[PDB]
């Protein structure tokens, strides 16, 4: 099984809400130290959200006020968008980094296609 469970595509309603699942089974001994969500445009991704040691940070203006990332359940870093725009259609990447105190590091990422339907 892949570490991150992310569907190959999600369809959301124009002007409404969508959830992009990204989940994993936490492993004892590792700490989640970074979550990044990225969006494609067009041959390179840009970071739209970071969760780091200083909290949650939206990183692109067009997502300000419209983007939430789950945090309640360990292993669930799903992203929700509000007031979906046609220009939100793209491929989105969930990227998670784990470390140990002695410095080992593991990273995984996974891509979903967001479709927006009228």
């Amino acid at each position, epitope marked *: *099984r892949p*570490i991150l469970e992310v569907p190959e595509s999600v369809t959301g309603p124009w002007k409404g809400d969508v959830n992009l699942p990204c989940t994993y089974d936490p492993l004892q001994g590792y700490t989640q130290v970074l979550v990044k969500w990225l969006v494609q445009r067009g041959s*390179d991704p840009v970071t739209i959200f970071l969760r780091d040691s200083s909290g949650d940070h939206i990183q692109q203006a067009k997502y300000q006020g419209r983007l939430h990332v789950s945090h309640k359940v360990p292993g669930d870093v799903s992203l929700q968008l509000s007031t979906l725009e046609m220009d939100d259609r793209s491929h989105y990447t969930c990227e998670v980094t784990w470390q140990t105190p002695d410095g080992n590091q593991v990273v*995984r*990422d996974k891509i979903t296609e967001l479709r927006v339907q009228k």
Partner: nanobody, 125 residues
Framework: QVQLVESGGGLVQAGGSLRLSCAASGRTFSSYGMGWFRQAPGKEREFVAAIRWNGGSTYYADSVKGRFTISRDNAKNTVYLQMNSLKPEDTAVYYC??????????????????WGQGTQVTVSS
């Protein structure tokens, strides 16, 4: 699908050269990371090379660095493995795989969802 179809295998002399191809079906090729794996007799499947969806980065097993080159053509829905300076240790069945990793995890077979039936490579002393 994607269905993945490999070709290009053969029996070659040590020092020689082959090129494997992998033809993908569907229209979603360009969104997948692509990789090559191999399985030698009486051994487990192992990573060989991978290439990001956008061609931006490539990744190689240490043992094939500088001898093998992976490339892709998103317009022709094909991935290639140029295999130069072949060694007997390179003998194996070679498999093409597609996954939705972006730039991490490409060495792990578990991070791929589609696999071809493979093509056979033998390198002789």
């Amino acid at each position: 699908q994607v269905q993945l179809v490999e070709s290009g295998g053969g029996l070659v002399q040590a020092g020689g050269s082959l090129r494997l191809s992998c033809a993908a079906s569907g229209r979603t090729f360009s969104s997948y990371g692509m990789g090559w794996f191999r399985q030698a007799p009486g051994k487990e499947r192992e990573f060989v090379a991978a290439i990001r969806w956008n061609g931006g980065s490539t990744y190689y097993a240490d043992s094939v660095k500088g001898r093998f080159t992976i490339s892709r053509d998103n317009a022709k829905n094909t991935v290639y493995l140029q295999m130069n300076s072949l060694k007997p240790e390179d003998t194996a069945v070679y498999y093409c795989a597609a996954g939705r990793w972006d730039k991490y995890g490409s060495s792990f077979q578990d991070e791929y969802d589609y696999w071809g039936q493979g093509t056979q490579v033998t390198v002789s002393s």
